[PDB]
Design a protein around this ligand. Structure first.
Ligand code: OGA
Ligand code: MG
Ligand code: NI
Ligand code: ZN
Length: 331
């Protein structure tokens, strides 16, 4: 069995290996990368996502989200308070202001310590889930706006033709902006490219151990757990590495820098934070190996998780018994 300790693997494809996206994912899996729940891919030195980032300031963040925390430093939830629209140039200036900028620090480890000590005492503003792409249309390799769609994968594997679309999303972050513990919708893969700016630290639980994280979360967030049998789908709960280690939960951590791709694998729980002003692009994707994970994915039916149009068909075809209840939660 490859990668039996479920370590995060880092890949350096050549320019020739970077041509065929599906083939390279399957390669990484042949080496056990999925066992970690997360892999890093460093593009060949010949590759670029686009020519420059000098002209992005006029992108609009229609609904910036202020991430307000409640709880204790290592075990907290966050809610998202909507703020007035602002441009990426305005948001960058905000991120760099004395109120929001990254503090002085020695290295990534010191910064990580400061994040876990101090996160809850501040409310950083995140531009999330903005439909669009920063890949140049002429970038042929690993262009997250040109990937094979999940609907076409389901159709290729299972023969059923379904409605829905699959497009990328932009994320503009600042110091302390936080992504809560979650798996993807329908336990899909994700791919995330850090276009510019400061790093993103990730934490991940191996897929084979995901239920250990879920059981800890039910203990740590007992009211939420009573409210919903899949409350991590709400994407609001944070648990620190120290707490995870205290409770024996297997996990790994890695820091993504600008120019690097991360892939999350089906049912790989992940969480993390941004080091300072940055911009990432991410999208879900599928492979044949995902299908069985999609059929088994938990679902929120309490009404909190509310998701895209395109997830309807996935539930309807893969999970027909659950469909009726889940759809009620959507409506
Ligand atoms: O970058 C972020 O804020 C969150 N991204 C992801 O969870 C991802 O790519 O799967
Ligand atoms: Mg612009
Ligand atoms: Ni994710
Ligand atoms: Zn729910």
């Amino acid at each position: 069995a490859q990668n039996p300790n479920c370590n995060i693997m880092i890949f350096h494809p050549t320019k020739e290996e970077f041509n065929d996206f599906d083939k390279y994912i399957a390669y990484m899996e042949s080496q056990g990368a999925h066992r970690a729940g997360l892999a890093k891919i460093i593009p060949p030195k010949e590759w670029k996502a686009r020519e420059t980032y000098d002209n992005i300031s006029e992108i609009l963040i229609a609904t910036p989200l202020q991430q307000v925390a409640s709880g204790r430093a290592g075990v907290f939830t966050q809610y998202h308070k909507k703020k007035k629209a602002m441009t990426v140039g305005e948001y960058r200036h905000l991120a760099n202001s004395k109120k929001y900028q990254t503090p002085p620090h020695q290295n990534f480890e010191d910064l990580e310590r400061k994040y876990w000590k101090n996160r809850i005492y501040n409310s950083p503003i995140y531009g999330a889930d903005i439909s669009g792409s920063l890949f140049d249309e002429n970038t042929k390799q690993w262009n997250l706006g040109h990937l094979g769609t999940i609907q076409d994968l389901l159709e290729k594997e299972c023969g059923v033709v379904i409605e829905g679309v699959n497009t990328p999303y932009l994320y503009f972050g600042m110091w302390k902006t936080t992504f809560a513990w979650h798996t993807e919708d329908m336990d899909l893969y994700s791919i995330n490219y850090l276009h510019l700016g400061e790093p993103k630290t990730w934490y991940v639980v191996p897929p084979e151990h995901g239920q250990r994280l879920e059981r800890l979360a039910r203990e740590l967030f007992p009211g939420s757990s009573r409210g919903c049998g899949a409350f991590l789908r709400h994407k609001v709960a944070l648990i620190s590495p120290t707490v995870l280690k205290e409770n024996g939960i297997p996990f790994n951590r890695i820091t993504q820098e600008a120019g690097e791709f991360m892939v999350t694998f089906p049912y790989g729980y992940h969480a993390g934070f941004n080091h300072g002003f940055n911009c990432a692009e991410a999208i879900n994707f599928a492979t044949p190996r995902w299908i069985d994970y999609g059929k088994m994915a938990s679902q929120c039916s309490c009404g909190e998780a509310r998701v895209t149009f395109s997830m309807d068909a996935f539930v309807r075809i893969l999970q027909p018994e659950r469909y009726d209840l889940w759809k009620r939660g959507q409506d």
